[PDB]
Design a protein around this ligand. Structure first.
Ligand SMILES: *[C@@H]1O[C@H](CO)[C@@H](O)[C@H](O)[C@H]1NC(C)=O
Ligand SMILES: *[C@@H]1O[C@H](CO)[C@@H](O)[C@H](O)[C@H]1NC(C)=O
Ligand SMILES: *[C@@H]1O[C@H](CO)[C@@H](O)[C@H](O)[C@H]1NC(C)=O
Ligand SMILES: *[C@@H]1O[C@H](CO)[C@@H](O)[C@H](O)[C@H]1NC(C)=O
Ligand SMILES: *[C@@H]1O[C@H](CO)[C@@H](O)[C@H](O)[C@H]1NC(C)=O
Ligand SMILES: *[C@@H]1O[C@H](CO)[C@@H](O)[C@H](O)[C@H]1NC(C)=O
Ligand SMILES: *[C@@H]1O[C@H](CO)[C@@H](O)[C@H](O)[C@H]1NC(C)=O
Ligand SMILES: *[C@@H]1O[C@H](CO)[C@@H](O)[C@H](O)[C@H]1NC(C)=O
Ligand SMILES: *[C@@H]1O[C@H](CO)[C@@H](O)[C@H](O)[C@H]1NC(C)=O
Ligand SMILES: *[C@@H]1O[C@H](CO)[C@@H](O)[C@H](O)[C@H]1NC(C)=O
Lengths: 358, 358
């Protein structure tokens, strides 16, 4: 049976840093291979024709069936899988690597579906030209996707391949299609990132043109495949009037606490409640918290991690359809304000191993 | 006969633009007398020897006993009265005018107390050296108050004058003392104004030093006079741990909607309820919403003004101790996004005359 996001609930994890690369997730990897680049675009440029061999090794080794077993043992029922657009289309001007990403995606998705009946969200984390001027959108400094009909068409070509991957998977009912991640056209000053000010009405109109095109394409092939819309950092309420209630649509909200607020480990449940109570729409469409983590801006403490993770899970499940944590596997050693490093707050496998869900 | 802000409830108004001047409140005044200045400081500098005569005329005519009768007829029971520090002390390095402000304040306050038993909040809206780089803090570009013992000392001199006014008033039980308004040390980029990022922890420590000194000074003379702490745009929770619950303290929160969010006239009650639910503290101390107004960032409509004012009044008096609208009398004709001008959304006497409170 296909899922109805209005009645489905699940707690999940992101498989971040696996098919798309970021400096913070694995410090050893980045130090060894980036040449100091800020982005996956530059890491691949730095490696030159060794970019593919290095990345294929990481694809084959970072996330294996054993990771899926560990996640299932901790009660995970949803995997969100960020991918670069270059897994789906090979554009000669892109510096992102086009390889066997989807073969590893299929191996891990098949195992999670056939073994555990997990639900899989396929996220095209970047789109051609760049959606937010960050590494995750294509490359640092790239916002060329907006208002560009060539990049629009390439984005639809990418989505035609993701729909086909789902439709021919053997279990189309196991997947949700997420065609954009954190679009932003007003974040030259990063103080507005994570806020409604990251996306202007002009940018939002282009995003809406794209999501409407994706919805029409999915409906033309298989209307039972849900579309997960990551509406930047606008409240879901902002987009509600743009879609009829009959659309097979779920919103993906992202909630973080690690900068730009007076959060602490002590008060983190108050900030999580605020986000759940104020940023979950009116109920017109369902909401899933597709990314979050417990790192606070100030005064991180190690002893409140279990309390904070469990408070977040219960909050997202109470005000929305559940959540997926960023991220499954994280070894980055960037210092946090207070106790420890990012790997102590951002690695979901560590929480499982330390018995937070027993 | 003194009030306990934990039990007291009241709906009030600000008498803004009366004893402190701002460009938006009265366009004819500003266009005639400012010479293009951004601030009261520069308006007074431009007028030179005519500054006093021009301001004394406004003091005597803008707010009269007739205004108090109209406000009372609309159910007003609290007056918040913004003053410049120059009402209280005459510093030789200040371009703000020192005249008969407190004589006009006493005529109106005494009338309001004797006739209607209104409660009076005396607000020192500016302090020597400037508390937020804005005209309201002293002058555009002035942040000199922070970490400066000269300005600290003359601030305490201002507070001694306000305490003496209250104690010699003939009704000390009728007054709350508010010794600062919207301090901000991190608003050189005004995108952070209205948010917690407008005040750094370093600036917040200086504000705390000052409020602790004011609380001690009032406790030393008449501990039954409440102190109203306007803690910038931090959540009240930020400051709660800094005072014992026995402190005769109330927080003043300021909630506005006219920039930096996806607010509309249609959705304004959602934004009002979000502020009340998340920005009212934990209950350790009482909260009063000392400034608010109904102008939204987008799609202002005149038709929803009554619904929006009543929604806000009801929300602030349920989740806190009430509110005071900005402002009693407003003729500024700056355009808003949507229909109308600022005078349609910022003039409380207009709401009374349209029968909103009948
Ligand atoms: C962080 O990881 C990098 C790369 O492995 C390593 O060079 C560095 O010494 C680490 N720092 C600490 C303090 O562990
Ligand atoms: C892609 O996978 C195929 C089949 O397993 C393999 O033959 C080939 O070497 C892989 N290509 C790269 C670029 O690693
Ligand atoms: C859109 O992107 C294409 C591919 O880079 C580029 O050649 C073109 O100049 C851009 N068009 C506009 C409208 O800027
Ligand atoms: C985009 O794709 C459509 C449909 O195939 C085509 O009609 C259109 O001309 C293309 N536009 C560009 C800029 O390539
Ligand atoms: C864009 O961001 C700037 C801050 O860099 C902000 O001042 C401005 O209001 C934002 N514009 C929109 C439409 O969000
Ligand atoms: C605003 O009022 C000023 C001062 O009376 C007047 O000169 C100006 O034309 C008005 N602007 C309008 C009505 O928008
Ligand atoms: C202040 O009020 C007093 C008493 O009515 C009056 O004598 C004086 O002229 C006024 N001062 C100024 C500077 O207008
Ligand atoms: C405080 O600041 C003013 C400038 O606003 C300066 O004249 C004064 O010397 C400073 N006082 C101290 C004690 O630094
Ligand atoms: C502030 O007043 C205190 C107490 O009278 C005095 O000791 C000090 O020197 C004054 N500081 C300045 C900078 O005027
Ligand atoms: C100060 O404001 C800037 C934006 O202009 C923001 O980037 C920064 O985080 C703020 N700092 C603090 C300590 O609030």
């Amino acid at each position: 049976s296909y899922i109805d996001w209005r009645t489905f609930k699940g707690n999940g994890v992101n498989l971040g840093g696996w098919l798309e690369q970021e400096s913070t997730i694995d410090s050893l990897f980045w130090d060894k291979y980036s040449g100091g680049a800020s982005d996956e675009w530059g890491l691949c440029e730095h490696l030159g024709s060794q970019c593919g061999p290095v990345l294929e090794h990481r694809y084959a080794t970072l996330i294996t069936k054993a990771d899926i077993d560990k996640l299932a043992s901790g009660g995970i029922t949803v995997l969100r899988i960020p991918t670069t657009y270059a897994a789906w289309i090979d554009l000669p001007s892109s510096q992102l690597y086009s390889g066997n990403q989807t073969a590893y995606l299929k191996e891990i998705a098949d195992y999670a579906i056939k073994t555990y009946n997990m639900h899989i969200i396929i996220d095209t984390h970047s789109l051609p030209g760049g959606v937010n001027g960050l590494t995750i959108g294509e490359a640092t400094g790239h916002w060329y996707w907006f208002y560009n009909e060539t990049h629009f068409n390439y984005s639809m070509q990418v989505i035609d391949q993701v729909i086909n991957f789902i439709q021919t998977s053997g279990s189309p009912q196991s997947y949700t299609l997420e065609p954009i991640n954190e679009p932003a056209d007003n974040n030259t000053n990063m103080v507005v990132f994570g806020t409604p000010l990251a996306l202007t009405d002009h940018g939002a109109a282009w995003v809406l043109k794209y999501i409407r095109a994706v919805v029409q394409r999915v409906e033309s092939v298989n209307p039972n495949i849900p579309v997960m819309f990551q509406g930047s950092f606008k409240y879901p309420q902002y987009w509600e009037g743009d879609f009829p209630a009959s659309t097979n649509l779920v919103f993906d909200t992202h909630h973080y606490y690690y900068e730009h607020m007076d959060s602490s480990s002590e008060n983190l449940p108050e900030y999580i409640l605020a986000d759940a109570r104020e940023k979950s729409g009116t109920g017109k469409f369902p909401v899933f918290v597709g990314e979050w983590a417990i790192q606070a801006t100030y005064n991180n403490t190690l002893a409140l991690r279990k309390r904070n993770v469990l408070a977040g899970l219960e909050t997202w499940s109470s005000f929305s359809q559940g959540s997926s944590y960023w991220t499954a596997k994280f070894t980055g050693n960037t210092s946090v304000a207070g106790q420890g490093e990012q790997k102590d707050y951002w690695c979901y496998e560590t929480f499982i191993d330390e018995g937070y869900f027993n």
